[PDB]
């Protein structure tokens, strides 16, 4: 996260840090708890990943330092990538991780509600982007979970900032005309939490953009509301 600050412990209980153990353990992506055994994250976060076996999901984490060889984690039983996904920039950048065990909810780890199809004409206030991602073009995973308040931008406005791309209605962007605050490498899969009437909603999933926090270059996120049917279909046994 660029231009953000340290989050308070338990302030984003749905945020998880997804690690890979190969070659050696490290943070790979962010993700969101949406069900007792479900993590919603980004599809392009599994590039080169041929097995769920090297994955480890950690919940209720604030500082990466809390994670050691003796720290408990959730194994991943299955990785579900949208069958239409090809690459972040083309859309459908969404994936579901079915955990091997159930998450016992608590103040430190609980699910975030998905937006409703009726929440489309709703103006989201208090939108934040979080993660342990880079702080700059060429930085490194951050120890403390970072947070940054970032306003949503209309698709038409976003499209103007990405003439070479096609910003579809299945995407949603957020950023400042002058940049300064934005997601960066490592925040992918991270949730775009947004407040709607006192209730936190998972509006988007950190997907892509050009550089980090650059002027006139809004972050691009998967428009979650457009996938509620897909999520239901894939999570219902
Ligand atoms: B993501 C990731 C990669 C690159 C960026 C920078 C462009 N996006 C912006 N500025 N919003 C953000 C996030 O983090 C983990 C990796 C996994 O492949 O991708």
- How do the residues of the chain divide into helix, strand and coil, expressed in percent and rounded to 5? 15, 35, 50
Residues 87 and 150 in one domain: no
Q: Report how far apart the first and last C-alpha atoms of the chain are (Å, whole number).
A: 35
Round to whole Å and give the CA distance between 121 and 133: 31
Question: 118 and 92 in one domain?
Answer: no
For residue 83, indicate whether it is catalytic.
no
The alpha carbon dihedral of 156, 158, 162, 166 has a sign of: negative
- Residue 46 contacts by C-beta under 8 Å, 6 or more apart in sequence? 79, 81, 95
Q: Tell me if 102 sits within 8 A of 37, measured CB to CB.
A: yes
Residues 80 and 23 in one domain: yes
Give ligand 1 pocket residues (Cβ under 6 A): 29, 44-45, 133, 182-188, 206, 208-209, 211-212, 219
Nearest to 38 by CA among 110, 87, 107, 86: 110
Same domain, 101 and 118: no
Is 163 annotated to bind a ligand? Reply is yes
User: Which 8-state DSSP code applies to residue 195?
Assistant: E
Q: How many domains does the chain have?
A: 2
Q: Is 44 a catalytic residue?
A: yes
Task: Give the CATH number of the domain where residue 169 resides.
Answer: 2.40.10.10
Give the 3-state secondary structure of 121-163: CCCCEEEEEEECCCCCCCCCCCCECEEEECCEECHHHHHHHCC
Looking from the CA of 106 toward its CB, the CA atoms found within 13 Å total: 9
How many angstroms separate the alpha carbon of residue 108 from the centre of ligand 1? 26
Q: Please spell the DSSP secondary structure of 74-96, one letter per residue.
A: EEEEEEEE-TT---GGGS---EE
Please tell me the distance between residue 125's alpha carbon and the centre of ligand 1 in angstroms: 24
Distances (CA, A) of 225 to 76, 211, 218: 24, 26, 19
Q: Give the number of other Cβ atoms within 10 Å of residue 136's Cβ.
A: 13
Same domain, yes or no, for 120 and 205? yes
- 26 is annotated as contributing to ligand binding: no
Question: CA angle 170-154-141, nearest 5°?
Answer: 70
Q: Which two tokens stand for residue 214?
A: 């650059």
Q: Do 97 and 143 fall into the same domain?
A: no
Q: Measure the CA angle with vertex 162, ends 160 and 165; round to 5°.
A: 125
**Secondary element (H or E) of residue 222:** strand 219-223
Shared-domain flag, residues 7 and 18? no
Residue of 19, 44, 196, 201 with catalytic role: 44
Distance CA 192, CA 194 (A): 6
Write the DSSP symbol of residue 106: B
CA distances from 82 to 69, 86, 176, 214, 216 (A): 32, 9, 30, 29, 30
Q: Which atom of ligand 1 is nearest to the CA of 212?
A: 10
Strands 191-195 and 15-20, bridge-based pairing:
unpaired
117 shares a domain with 69: no
CA of 45 to the centre of ligand 1 (A): 9
Ordered alpha helix ranges (H), the chain: 155-161, 228-235
d(CA 41, CA 33): 9
Q: Which residues precede a break in the chain, with C-to-N distance above 2.5 Å?
A: none
Contacts of 109 (CB under 8 A, 6+ apart): 13, 14, 33, 59, 60, 103
Experiment type: X-ray
The upper half-sphere exposure of residue 213, i.e. CA atoms within 13 Å in the direction of its Cβ, equals 21
Range of 62's domain?
13-111+227-237
Output the CA 186–ligand 1 centroid distance in Å: 6
Q: How many residues does the chain have?
A: 237
For tokens 């599994």, name the residue.
46
Q: Let me know whether 17 and 101 are in one domain.
A: yes
Structure-block tokens of residue 30: 């962010």
The tokens describing 28, both together, are: 């790979």
Question: What does the H/E/C string look like for 208-224?
Answer: ECCCCCCCCCCEEEEEH
Do 60 and 106 lie in one domain? The reply is yes
Could you tell me if 220 and 231 lie in one domain? no
């Amino acid at each position: 996260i660029v231009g953000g600050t340290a989050s308070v412990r338990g302030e984003w209980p749905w945020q998880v840090t997804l690690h890979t153990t190969s070659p050696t353990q490290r943070h790979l992506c962010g993700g969101s708890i949406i069900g007792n055994q479900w993590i919603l994250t980004a599809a392009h976060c599994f590039y080169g990943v041929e097995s769920p076996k090297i994955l480890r999901v950690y919940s209720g984490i604030l500082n990466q330092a809390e994670i050691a060889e003796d720290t408990s984690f959730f194994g991943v039983q299955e990785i579900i990538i949208h069958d239409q996904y090809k690459m972040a920039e083309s859309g459908y950048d969404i994936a579901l991780l079915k955990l091997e065990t159930t998450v016992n909810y608590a103040d430190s780890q609980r699910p975030i509600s998905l937006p409703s199809k009726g929440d489309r004409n709703v103006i989201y206030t208090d939108c934040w982007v979080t993660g342990w991602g880079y702080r700059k073009l060429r930085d490194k995973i951050q120890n403390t979970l970072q947070k940054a308040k970032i306003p949503l931008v209309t698709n038409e406005e976003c499209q103007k900032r990405y003439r070479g791309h096609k910003i579809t209605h299945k995407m949603i962007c957020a950023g400042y005309r002058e940049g300064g605050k934005d997601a960066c490498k490592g925040d992918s899969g991270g949730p775009l939490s947004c407040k709607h009437n006192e209730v936190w909603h998972l509006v988007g999933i950190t997907s892509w953009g050009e550089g980090c926090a650059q002027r006139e270059r809004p972050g691009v996120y998967t428009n979650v509301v457009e996938y509620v049917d897909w999520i239901l279909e894939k999570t219902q046994a």
